[PDB]
Structure 1
Amino acid sequence: AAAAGPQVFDVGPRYTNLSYIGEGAYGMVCSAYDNLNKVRVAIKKISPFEHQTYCQRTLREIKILLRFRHENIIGINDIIRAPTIEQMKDVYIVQDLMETDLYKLLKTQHLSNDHICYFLYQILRGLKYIHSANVLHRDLKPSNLLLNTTCDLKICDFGLARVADPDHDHTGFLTEYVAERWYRAPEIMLNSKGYTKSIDIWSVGCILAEMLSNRPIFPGKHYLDQLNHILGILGSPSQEDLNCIINLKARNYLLSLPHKNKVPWNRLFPNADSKALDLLDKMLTFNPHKRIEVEQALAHPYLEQYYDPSDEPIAEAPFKFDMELDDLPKEKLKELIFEETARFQPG
């Protein structure tokens, strides 16, 4: 078995000339030469079978990525695992090699207006598909946007993704949340489980702001600070938008805060295209009901060079029902992962 930083990175006959390209969630990532397609590929080694949580996120990601087929969503090209459940301790996911991600790129590179526009278009084109499958990504952020050397953009990391469930979106004030703090919609901190499509549009809005300035727009240091950051730019919510928050504890928290006026986007982003700021405004709308939808965003004048709804496909096979994964034991989840990965076996 081939070794790297040894641990075991055992990827069969097909994949050779391994190079460590960092750590991931439940294992390590290497590039490799695909001896069959004659290209360098990315391979992620995953070891989740000890933890119900790691199993759930792995199964969710595999089920979604295998069902989805879209230019702006990372595909699974292969999955390497032992031929039996008993021998399966690890799973290797083979994906297109993407040389960087928007997180890494924004560390050092200034984006041209043309790059910002093309990246935003591709994010929303991928997100249109995701949402058309009745799926929410729920963890959109620069590190989950992969880029290759020709600036093709692919959304990745569906470990926190859920089937949309607007009916069951309500929760109490200060409900604990998993997805990265700085990209969370205001309603997550107030009264939302993040089970509606509008939470993903907020994250895209945050990413657009970050592309315009190379710094996170709402770098909250703590759960409620995320909201003070948002209201420090957007200003105090309107009476109308408060009237939409019926949770008394969430509404009274907002009422307790001193009045804050809106900071104009052109003051924050003086170098920005005016059309980009108009669209930013509509994505970073406090009220999730008034927030722009993905298809409206694609149709915005900022994106007019790219917009072509005939070339913006939707999903053939939406997830119509909850994937009831939350209270399945590890052992069943391992069986489902085994079954889900069976198509890639010589077998």
Structure 2
Amino acid sequence: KVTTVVATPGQGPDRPQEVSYTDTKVIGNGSFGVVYQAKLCDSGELVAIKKVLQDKRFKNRELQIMRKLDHCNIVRLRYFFYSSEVYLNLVLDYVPETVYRVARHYSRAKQTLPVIYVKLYMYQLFRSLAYIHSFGICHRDIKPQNLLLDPDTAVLKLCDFGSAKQLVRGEPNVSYICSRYYRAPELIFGATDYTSSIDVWSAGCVLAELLLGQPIFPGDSGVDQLVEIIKVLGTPTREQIREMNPNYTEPQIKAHPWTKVFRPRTPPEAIALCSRLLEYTPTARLTPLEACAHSFFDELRDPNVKLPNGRDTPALFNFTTQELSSNPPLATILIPPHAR
């Protein structure tokens, strides 16, 4: 009925606090681990609790990554504790929806997700990426299930840092790492020297999916995932293949134009954004901050903009100087006059 634990706060120094929660039910049981929902006894606040098997031989990478992060578009680690063969327990802010589930309502209702929500959710995603990439943390599992929503406030929160890694040049990494559909072509090509731009490819695949109503590259297998990319982008050149994976040394299909991929209705600026994210050569793709400053998101910088339910937009321009470090002159576009 009532559970009490001695939990350590994610921020601050290691000063554990007795925490009591109740109304414990299982809301998720997957490869991510087991996830519960619960109500904190002092504030009545809803928390999600993520529980994974953790042997003491190594420090948990996800916990080490979570404790650094403090950002409004990322789910906050409130506390952590140990239980039970030993499990790590992350107590996290509860978020009631996901982009996966929302996109699916619209799709099964044969309805388009309104472009205003496409903008809000994707801007907030890119912002969360700029923040973590500024620390060299690549998420490596950007997909609709990991994008949590409050549908009343339109706030998006990136979650699950269980695949996340601080990438450092020279130290190679594994090529098979995202959800197939959202996997960057360099990864398919077996690059071990990849950058944070793999998250930007994944972001693009989410963007396109929200415009199309269905995944743009629904690969039948690990190998068919590339055949599906070839259909749209065309066959990558020798020059492009070298940039994705230099070791891959050595079939034509022509590029299908970007306008004709989407419905006639689709805003050109949305299309232009897809083309600057879903490039073959990783270094050509936009950075998360450049993406946030793309003209597709100009409506979010309009002073008059509101949500369809009547409320104001969430906090979109309260940038810290840490967030702006990668390209500070983008502040003159990212923070409009009315916000300064």
1:93 paired residue number: 90
Shift of 1:11: 5.2
1:64-83 matches, within 5 Å, as: 64-81=65-82
Contiguous gaps of at least 5 residues in structure 2:
6-18, 107-111, 302-314, 326-340
Distance 1:265 1:152 in 2: 29
* Equivalent residues of 2:186, 2:194 under 8 A apart: no
What do residues 269-309 of structure 1 show as CA deviations (whole Å, max 9, x unaligned)?
Answer: 11321101100110001111211111211111001233699
Equivalent in 77, 91, 114 of residue 112 of structure 1: 114
SS at match of 1:178: coil
Cα distance, 1:37–1:88 mapped onto 2, change above 3 Å: farther
Distance 1:43 1:246 in 2: 39
Contiguous gaps of at least 5 residues in structure 1:
3-9, 319-347
1:268-307 matches, within 5 Å, as: 268-270=261-263, 271-306=265-300
Amino acid at match of 2:41: N
SS at match of 1:221: coil
* Equivalent residues of 1:72, 1:155 under 8 A apart: yes
Scaled by the length of structure 1, the TM-score of the pair is: 0.76
Cα distance, 1:290–1:213 mapped onto 2, change above 3 Å: same
Distance 1:91 1:148 in 2: 26
1:334 paired residue number: none
SS at match of 1:28: strand
Distance 1:74 1:194 in 2: 28
* Equivalent residues of 2:21, 2:39 under 8 A apart: yes
Distance 1:201 1:22 in 2: 27
- For the pair 1:31 / 2:26, whether they are aligned, the reply is no
What do residues 22-46 of structure 1 show as CA deviations (whole Å, max 9, x unaligned)?
Answer: 2143642222111222222212232
Shift of 1:264: 2.0
Say which is worse superposed, 187-196 or 138-147, in terms of deviation. 187-196
Identify, as 1 or 2, the structure richer in strand.
2
1:73-222 matches, within 5 Å, as: 73-81=74-82, 89-109=86-106, 110-149=112-151, 150-168=153-171, 176-193=175-192, 195-222=194-221
Distance 1:274 1:93 in 2: 42
Say which is worse superposed, 233-242 or 290-299, in terms of deviation. 233-242
Amino acid at match of 1:284: L
Distance 2:104 2:262 in 1: 18
- For the pair 1:18 / 2:20, whether they are aligned, the reply is no
Amino acid at match of 1:209: A
Question: How many percent identity over aligned positions?
Answer: 32
What do residues 161-209 of structure 1 show as CA deviations (whole Å, max 9, x unaligned)?
Answer: 111224445x8xxx75132111111111224226412111100001101
Distance 2:113 2:46 in 1: 27
Amino acid at match of 2:25: S
Shift of 1:88: 7.6
Say which is worse superposed, 36-45 or 304-313, in terms of deviation. 304-313
Q: What count of residue pairs does the alignment treat as equivalent? A: 291
Shift of 1:138: 0.9
Amino acid at match of 1:132: S
Cα distance, 1:196–1:243 mapped onto 2, change above 3 Å: closer
Shift of 1:223: 1.9
* Equivalent residues of 1:128, 1:314 under 8 A apart: no
Shift of 1:229: 0.9
Scaled by the length of structure 2, the TM-score of the pair is: 0.77
SS at match of 2:282: coil
Amino acid at match of 1:265: W
Cα distance, 1:152–1:310 mapped onto 2, change above 3 Å: closer
Distance 1:210 1:60 in 2: 30
Say which is worse superposed, 118-127 or 154-163, in terms of deviation. 154-163
SS at match of 1:228: helix
* Equivalent residues of 1:128, 1:312 under 8 A apart: no
Shift of 1:49: 2.7
* Equivalent residues of 2:140, 2:163 under 8 A apart: yes
Cα distance, 1:133–1:228 mapped onto 2, change above 3 Å: same
Amino acid at match of 2:77: I
1:265 paired residue number: 258
